[PDB]
């Protein structure tokens, strides 16, 4: 997690998916972006990338979270989904 930043996506409709595949790693805690769905909301923004850690969604702590909790926070959110990311180094 060598860089921490926020990326805010804007759902065009109430039920719009962000197009982020969230997976957990078996070697460390946290929720991570495995891949971005081609042409999806997050992929069109381009700010997000694979191997990013989702630290929080709309201020809701996902440090020791699960991809199901992340999905529930996005479902409960309005049109703005504010992701707080921790991108590793190189």
């Amino acid at each position: 997690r060598e860089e921490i930043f926020q990326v805010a996506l804007h759902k065009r409709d109430s039920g719009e998916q962000l197009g982020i595949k969230l997976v957990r790693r078996t070697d460390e805690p946290g929720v991570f972006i495995l891949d971005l769905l081609e042409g999806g909301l997050a992929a069109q923004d381009g700010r997000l990338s694979s191997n990013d850690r989702v630290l929080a969604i709309n201020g809701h702590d996902l440090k020791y979270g699960t991809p199901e909790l992340a999905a529930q926070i996005i479902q409960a959110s309005g049109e703005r989904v504010n992701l707080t990311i921790a991108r590793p180094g190189k």
């Binding site: 998916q17 962000l18 595949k21 969230l22 957990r24 769905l37 991809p67 199901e68 992340a70 999905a71």
Partner: peptide, 5 residues
């Protein structure tokens, strides 16, 4: 365990 959000 592994969702598309």
């Amino acid at each position: 365990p592994d969702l598309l959000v």
